[PDB]
Design a protein around this ligand. Structure first.
Ligand SMILES: [K+]
Ligand SMILES: [K+]
Ligand SMILES: [K+]
Ligand SMILES: [K+]
Ligand SMILES: [K+]
Ligand SMILES: [K+]
Ligand SMILES: [K+]
Ligand SMILES: [K+]
Ligand SMILES: [K+]
Ligand SMILES: [K+]
Ligand SMILES: [K+]
Ligand SMILES: [K+]
Ligand SMILES: [Mg+2]
Ligand SMILES: [Mg+2]
Ligand SMILES: [Mg+2]
Ligand SMILES: [Mg+2]
Ligand SMILES: [Mg+2]
Ligand SMILES: [Mg+2]
Ligand SMILES: [Mg+2]
Ligand SMILES: [Mg+2]
Ligand SMILES: [Mg+2]
Ligand SMILES: [Mg+2]
Ligand SMILES: [Mg+2]
Ligand SMILES: [Mg+2]
Ligand SMILES: [Mg+2]
Ligand SMILES: [Mg+2]
Ligand SMILES: [Mg+2]
Ligand SMILES: [Mg+2]
Ligand SMILES: [Mg+2]
Ligand SMILES: [Mg+2]
Ligand SMILES: [Mg+2]
Ligand SMILES: [Mg+2]
Ligand SMILES: [Mg+2]
Ligand SMILES: [Mg+2]
Ligand SMILES: [Mg+2]
Ligand SMILES: [Mg+2]
Ligand SMILES: [Mg+2]
Ligand SMILES: [Mg+2]
Ligand SMILES: [Mg+2]
Ligand SMILES: [Mg+2]
Ligand SMILES: [Mg+2]
Ligand SMILES: [Mg+2]
Ligand SMILES: [Mg+2]
Ligand SMILES: [Mg+2]
Ligand SMILES: [Mg+2]
Ligand SMILES: [Mg+2]
Ligand SMILES: [Mg+2]
Ligand SMILES: [Mg+2]
Ligand SMILES: [Mg+2]
Ligand SMILES: [Mg+2]
Lengths: 140, 166, 95, 107, 41, 97, 148, 80, 191
RNA sequence: GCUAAACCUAGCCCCAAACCCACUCCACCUUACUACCAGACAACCUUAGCCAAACCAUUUACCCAAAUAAAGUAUAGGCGAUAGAAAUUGAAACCUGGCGCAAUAGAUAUAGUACCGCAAGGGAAAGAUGAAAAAUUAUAACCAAGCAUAAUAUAGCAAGGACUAACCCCUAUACCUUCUGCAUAAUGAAUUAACUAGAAAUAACUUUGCAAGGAGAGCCAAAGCUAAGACCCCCGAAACCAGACGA
RNA sequence: CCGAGCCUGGUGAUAGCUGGUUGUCCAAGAUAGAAUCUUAGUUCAACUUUAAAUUUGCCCACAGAACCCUCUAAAUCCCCUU
RNA sequence: CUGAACUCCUCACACCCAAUUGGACCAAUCUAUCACCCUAUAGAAGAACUAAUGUUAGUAUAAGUAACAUGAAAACAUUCUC
RNA sequence: CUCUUACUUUUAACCAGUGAAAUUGACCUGCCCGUGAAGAGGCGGGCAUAACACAGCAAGACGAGAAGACCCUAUGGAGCUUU
């Protein structure tokens, strides 16, 4: 019994359909496209780590810009909003800076208030009580 | 071999309605197995592409290439074939819609080289395809002007959104 | 070794193993010591005593010797008054 | 692949769920075979599951065409006009019961 | 395999039967008369 | 290219012809026939293969001693060469020893 | 198959070759363990436990003389004349429980096995069958089909 | 020629799809296509929207004057 | 498979005509190195690993195993209500249409295997009706086999055949181990 | 849109059976295919070597007149590699078939032709409508690479993440082999199509059967025995020997 | 392409050497050394894989393991408990 | 403060080592029996190619490149130059 | 040769006709310094940068061509010589 591959046409079309948008001979010649289709799938699989990284890099760049409009720096906004028990991430904050500017200035004024309370407490030796916005809500 | 170009002059369109506009006539014609290169012929079919029937015949009549005398013969017999068979009223009211070249069935002979070496030369052949359309040659597209460049640039500046946000 | 003979098409036996070793039905191979007849005048009685002793072989050796012999040499024989008859079966062996 | 495929923005059909929820699945067309091992799982789904599935979804019209076929398929049509064709070839009842319900949930 | 080389159309010039037989004599093409009982209807 | 453009003619099979309807009959001629006949005697084909099984070297060795005196000179010469090649492969070449 | 060498190319040396040093099966001296193994006589042992088991099941009747043929016909023993077998040796295993009065013929017999048969009122005799006769006594029918 | 039927059958299906794309057919009404029951499709219309429609009324809400006039033209040609 | 003999065979690089000469020198030509034009790499060369027929697939299951499969086939036919006992296969007429209308009224099936005790004592009535049919086949009891029982939907046995089968199949459940082939004389065989 | 693509027959392979075996006239051992003149020339004779032995030097299986078994036993052997009986035992046998190939397959074969070689000798390629061609302005199209329809715009293994947006932004040192380690300026590859490479005993394991017995004479057996299943590739030297052909 | 011609055959010469070795998916998985006309290889061990049986294994407390003698070394072996 | 495939969070989980080894699936083909717009259970085997300066065939690149050709006029009669 | 120059012919280049070969993983085929299988068009930091033909040049592509002939290895060959 002599057996031969009868459906080799479909085996190569499921590879070339992903190379249709390439340039040159690696969009129609299996030998060349197969090596570039495999590199595309690897890039797309490793690109899921870059997307998450570049997003957070973008959010921070937009928050940094919106904080300088109010005379603040990125570390002083994020660090002092955490001290006020406000758990808002970079994604939301950058969205607020674009579409809710009046709410973002309220968050910057809060951070500047908590930042100034920290300096005042650093000048005292504990005798003076804590600030109004420096209090921490406890959860049992 | 494929001979679809000759079957396009056999399609019969349904009668047009009274309100529909006059449909231009299309005439397909070709010549097969021309002893000439398709690369050399491509430069001649590219020349008359878009020209009128009477202008193309004038450019091909004073060209020194061999393909010119061949194309001109194909155009003359497609011109007559149009008025005689395809109901074209004026023979000068025609323009070159399509004109290209194709590879033909070629032969293979041996070219002798030195030191008992040899090469394989091919006696090349080609086809010529032309399509004539009734009417005047479509007016050439004017070159893009500064108003269109600026109008397009401002349109790109207005189509830009805020990306990677709500 | 000859895995397929050219006349019968069957595995052959290496006759250099049959002239040196003895196989007990249990799977053990018994041999002599190399040098039990060489230069006895320079050797001690203790060394000569353990030279004329019949010793056993290990797993790797016995598996090789089992591949170099056919099934005829692995059958159970009932020779009359054989000195090794009692050694063809193991007793109180675990694992 | 993203660059080798198209894309769309998240959307709904006629602002669905805003005033009321309307099931988008509009029609289900089964093609089972009286004989054929490929359709064994589809035949058992028509005996006990399809009738109880129609009681819960009265807005879906279900057609069961029993004809000779080597590959049984279920065709789902939606209000927006989209048509999704799927194969239930050699699938158990449990696999076909979760599949049909997936089609009902989609838009 | 699957190779056939075809030449371009020849388009015979002379249409009349006399000229064909008048030109077949100049070319040595001898065409003996036919022999058949069946005739057209 | 490499795949036909039309469908092939249907492959119609008669599952109820003589050879298929009576296949397997008389396979237990021994059990039910008081062991007068043996099922291997129902096998037809080369006289050097009836009721026997072996590898290529075993098949070729068996054919050469059973019908080798009747073989054509060219075919016999090729048989002996085939046995030489297989003798070296099976007894000298391979992964296991 | 691995990478290169004789491993991947199928050119390994023969079995037993140790790479060049005198092999194990060659550096050991020769001793006559199996010298003349094809000319030694073998006797399939027949225990009194086996014999008593054959009598309690009716496979061997003690009312008639018991010889080598009746034992084979009853699937009590399996003699291999072509394997240098010369008969059966009556062994003493199961002598205590043995209780049967028989007339048995065995090519070899131990001193204790005889006592067990002579205690119950039986008779035991030792006879010699050559390789040719031993094949006829065990399988008579195939011999009667030879016209000899 | 290679022996087999599965690949040729599968290749004919791709050719049909290619032909449809090159020459897409004209659209037609869903009622003309198989698997259609007007009475069953109109009941689901209401239940789909969670409304207690009246079938007698709802069936006349989809009947248009243009369809009635043409439905008569078909009968006149056939004399029915 | 036990009576299968494959006749497929190919020629090796040693059996293809020619192919003895080295095509071109080992070095200098700038081409790949080849020793013959009939190697597997070539068009028209030998088959590296192809069929080397004629090849046999002969093997034997133990007698007791082959006799046990018949018991199972005879048991499965009864359990599934596909077994029908007869007293005699004598029809009133030799018409093949009668035997077909008789299997449809009783709802036997599309295929029926009729088993008779011997090949010479078969009534001519049933021999003239089954010789013209394709799904209504008639065999003697000695030709009973698992393959034909599974191919046919219905099994029909006569009373003599039943006793014949039980004797043969139960003799394996109580028999000594063979001293010599059962074709030779035995004390109580046959019968 | 060209080039092309697509097909199913020709016949072949393996068995069985049967032993096999010419012719019109004329010409042909001289320079064969050449009508006609003095002759006497005559046939026989161990194969070797490659290879294995990891060199090599004795040695290294080659149908030789019945399948099986005896038995890979006796025996031979740098007692190494390996080689290897007999006595005895004793079976079956109905040509007209195929889980064989289907035009790169299967015979080399359309042919031992064309062509190559002084000679011995080597040795191809390919075909395809239809019931009708006395229907040939015919049998639709849709499919490889290669081109054409339709050249190109900063920046980079050519893509991916994306994006309103093709490109611009960010990220990313082809593949295989071979190596301690290759983006390596180490190997191979123009590309498409087709062809092109893991063959098996010993024991052991798994799943049935029967069980101190197993096996359809042979053999094994101190739970074994029977059966099945499942593990051991391709191309490539320079060489050596025999017999022919050549000044 | 004569340090010894060519053709065919033995012949599928041999090659521890180079090259090549074709569907998907998961899993475990880097190794003291000895001998060898042997170090471009192989066999044994060691490492590694799978199945099976059984009971200890790893980590480690005291106590304990040399005089001759130059570095009075970092450590190790042994080892219940955990 | 920035900063991973580390860790947490929503959900899921057999789904990142050469040689080697173990295991679960499978394309097409033939056969048995089913099936009947292309499948099922099994049994078989010339059973799967991005690579061997691989074989054959087709078509590209180099490249419309290298290279190749016909002494002159005329009445095509003839003359003229070399 | 100092120390080259001028002219003729062939070649050449343009028009027309005909039409090969080695070569080629894919290419959208820049420079400097540094890095690194130790000598980068492809990596890092910088500089440069609309697209495109023709004719020239031979610094680089460890450029093409011939599985290095030198050297070493193979229990690989052969020729010659010999106490
Ligand atoms: K081997
Ligand atoms: K050698
Ligand atoms: K051929
Ligand atoms: K490579
Ligand atoms: K390198
Ligand atoms: K190199
Ligand atoms: K490279
Ligand atoms: K290499
Ligand atoms: K080596
Ligand atoms: K001058
Ligand atoms: K240069
Ligand atoms: K070079
Ligand atoms: Mg020459
Ligand atoms: Mg390799
Ligand atoms: Mg190595
Ligand atoms: Mg040959
Ligand atoms: Mg060779
Ligand atoms: Mg072939
Ligand atoms: Mg040697
Ligand atoms: Mg040597
Ligand atoms: Mg052929
Ligand atoms: Mg294409
Ligand atoms: Mg970049
Ligand atoms: Mg290196
Ligand atoms: Mg690197
Ligand atoms: Mg190298
Ligand atoms: Mg194998
Ligand atoms: Mg020699
Ligand atoms: Mg010679
Ligand atoms: Mg001379
Ligand atoms: Mg080789
Ligand atoms: Mg792992
Ligand atoms: Mg040595
Ligand atoms: Mg401890
Ligand atoms: Mg982070
Ligand atoms: Mg983790
Ligand atoms: Mg996990
Ligand atoms: Mg499938
Ligand atoms: Mg293959
Ligand atoms: Mg391929
Ligand atoms: Mg290749
Ligand atoms: Mg150039
Ligand atoms: Mg030139
Ligand atoms: Mg030119
Ligand atoms: Mg190269
Ligand atoms: Mg550098
Ligand atoms: Mg240039
Ligand atoms: Mg490069
Ligand atoms: Mg080299
Ligand atoms: Mg040699």
């Amino acid at each position: 019994l002599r057996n031969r591959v009868t459906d080799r046409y479909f085996r190569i079309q499921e590879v070339l359909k992903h190379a249709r948008h390439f340039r040159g001979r690696k969009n129609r010649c299996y030998r060349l496209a197969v090596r570039t289709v495999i590199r595309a799938f690897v890039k797309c699989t490793k690109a899921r780590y870059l997307k998450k990284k570049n997003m957070r890099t973008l959010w921070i760049n937009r928050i940094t810009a919106a904080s300088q409009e109010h005379g603040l720096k990125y570390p002083a906004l994020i660090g002092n909003l955490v001290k006020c028990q406000v758990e808002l991430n970079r994604k939301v904050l950058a969205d607020l800076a674009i579409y809710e500017p009046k709410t973002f200035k309220s968050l910057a004024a809060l951070a500047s208030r908590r930042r100034h309370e920290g300096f005042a407490a650093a000048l005292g030796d504990g005798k003076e009580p804590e600030g109004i916005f420096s209090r921490v809500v406890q959860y049992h | 071999i494929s001979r679809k170009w000759e079957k396009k002059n056999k399609i019969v369109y349904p009668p047009q309605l009274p309100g529909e506009p006059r449909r231009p006539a299309e005439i397909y014609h070709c010549r097969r197995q021309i002893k000439y290169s398709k690369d050399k012929m491509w430069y001649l079919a590219k020349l008359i592409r878009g020209m009128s029937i009477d202008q193309a015949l004038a450019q091909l009549e004073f060209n020194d290439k061999k393909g010119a005398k061949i194309i001109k013969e194909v155009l003359l017999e497609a011109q007559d074939m149009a008025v005689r068979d395809h109901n074209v009223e004026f023979r000068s009211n025609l323009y070159i819609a399509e004109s290209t070249s194709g590879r033909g069935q070629c032969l293979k002979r041996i070219r002798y080289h030195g030191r008992g070496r040899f090469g394989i030369m091919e006696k090349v052949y080609c086809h010529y395809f032309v399509k004539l359309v009734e009417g005047p040659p479509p007016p050439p597209e004017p070159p893009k002007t500064a108003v269109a460049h600026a109008k397009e640039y401002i349109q790109q500046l207005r189509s830009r959104t805020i990306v990677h946000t709500l | 070794l000859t895995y397929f003979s050219a006349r019968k098409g069957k595995r052959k036996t290496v006759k250099a193993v049959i002239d040196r070793f003895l196989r007990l039905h249990c799977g053990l191979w018994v041999r002599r010591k190399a040098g039990y007849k060489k230069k006895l005048w320079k050797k001690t009685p203790a060394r000569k005593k353990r030279l004329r002793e019949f010793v056993f072989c290990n797993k790797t050796q016995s598996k090789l010797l089992d591949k170099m012999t056919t099934s005829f040499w692995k059958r159970r024989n009932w020779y009359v008054d054989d000195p090794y008859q009692k050694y063809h079966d193991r007793t109180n062996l675990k694992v | 692949t993203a660059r080798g495929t198209p894309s769309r923005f998240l959307a709904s059909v006629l602002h669905n769920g805003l005033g009321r929820y309307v099931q988008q699945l509009q029609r289900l067309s089964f093609s089972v075979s009286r004989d054929g091992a490929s359709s064994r799982g589809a035949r058992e789904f028509v005996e006990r599951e399809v009738i109880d599935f129609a009681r819960r979804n009265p807005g879906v019209v279900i057609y069961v065409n029993s004809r000779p076929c080597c590959v049984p398929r279920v065709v789902a049509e939606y209000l927006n006009g989209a048509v999704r064709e799927e194969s239930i070839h050699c699938k158990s009842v449990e696999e076909i019961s979760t599949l049909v319900q997936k089609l009902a949930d989609q838009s | 395999t699957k190779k056939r080389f075809t030449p371009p159309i020849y388009q015979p010039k002379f249409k009349t039967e006399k000229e064909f037989m008048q030109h077949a004599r100049k070319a040595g093409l001898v065409i003996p008369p036919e022999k058949s009982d069946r005739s057209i209807h | 290219i490499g795949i036909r453009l039309t469908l092939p003619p249907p492959k119609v099979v008669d599952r109820w012809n003589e050879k298929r309807a009576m296949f397997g009959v008389y396979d237990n001629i021994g059990i039910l026939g008081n062991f007068e006949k043996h099922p291997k005697e129902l096998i037809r084909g080369p006289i050097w293969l009836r009721g026997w099984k072996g590898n290529e070297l075993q098949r070729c060795i068996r054919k050469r001693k059973m019908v080798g005196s009747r073989m054509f000179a060219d075919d016999l010469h090729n048989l002996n060469k085939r046995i030489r090649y297989l003798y070296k492969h099976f007894n000298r070449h391979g992964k296991f020893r | 198959r691995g990478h290169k060498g004789e491993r991947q190319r199928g050119t390994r040396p023969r079995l037993g070759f140790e790479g060049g040093q005198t092999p194990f099966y060659i550096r050991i001296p020769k001793y006559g363990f199996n010298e003349g193994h094809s000319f030694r006589r073998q006797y399939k042992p027949l225990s009194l436990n086996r014999l008593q088991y054959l009598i309690d099941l009716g496979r061997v009747d003690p009312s008639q003389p018991i010889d080598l043929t009746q034992l084979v016909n009853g699937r009590g023993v399996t003699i291999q004349p072509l394997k240098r077998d010369y008969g059966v040796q009556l062994v003493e295993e199961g002598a205590d429980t043995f209780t049967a009065k028989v007339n048995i013929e065995v090519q070899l017999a131990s001193e204790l096995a005889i006592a067990a048969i002579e205690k119950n009122g039986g008779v035991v005799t030792t006879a010699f069958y050559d390789p040719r006769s031993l094949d006829i006594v065990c399988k008579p029918v195939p011999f009667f089909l030879r016209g000899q | 020629v290679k022996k087999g039927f599965r690949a040729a059958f599968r290749f004919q299906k791709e050719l049909e799809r290619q032909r449809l794309l090159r020459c897409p057919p004209p659209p037609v009404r869903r009622s003309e296509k198989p698997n259609w029951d007007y009475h069953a499709e109109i009941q689901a219309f209401g239940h789909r929207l969670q409304e207690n429609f009246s079938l007698d009324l709802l069936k006349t809400a989809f009947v248009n004057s243009c369809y009635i006039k043409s439905e008569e033209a078909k009968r006149q040609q056939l004399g029915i | 498979n036990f009576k299968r003999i494959s006749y497929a065979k190919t020629k090796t690089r040693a059996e293809v005509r020619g192919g003895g000469r080295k095509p071109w020198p080992q070095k200098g030509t700038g081409r790949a190195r080849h020793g013959s034009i009939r190697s597997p790499l070539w068009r028209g060369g030998g088959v590296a690993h192809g069929p080397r027929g004629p090849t046999s697939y002969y093997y034997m299951l133990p007698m007791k195993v082959r006799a046990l499969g018949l018991k199972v086939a005879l048991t499965v036919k009864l359990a599934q209500d596909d077994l029908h006992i007869m007293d005699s296969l004598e029809l009133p007429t030799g018409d093949p249409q009668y035997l077909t209308e008789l299997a449809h009224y009783r709802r036997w099936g599309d295929s029926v295997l009729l088993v008779d005790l011997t090949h010479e004592e078969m009534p001519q009535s049933i021999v003239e009706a089954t010789s013209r049919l394709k799904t209504f086949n008639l065999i003697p009891a000695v030709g009973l086999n698992v393959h034909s029982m599974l191919k046919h939907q219905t099994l029909v046995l006569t009373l003599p055949t039943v006793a014949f089968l039980e004797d043969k199949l139960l003799w394996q459940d109580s028999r000594y181990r063979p001293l010599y082939p059962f074709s030779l004389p035995y004390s109580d065989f046959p019968r």
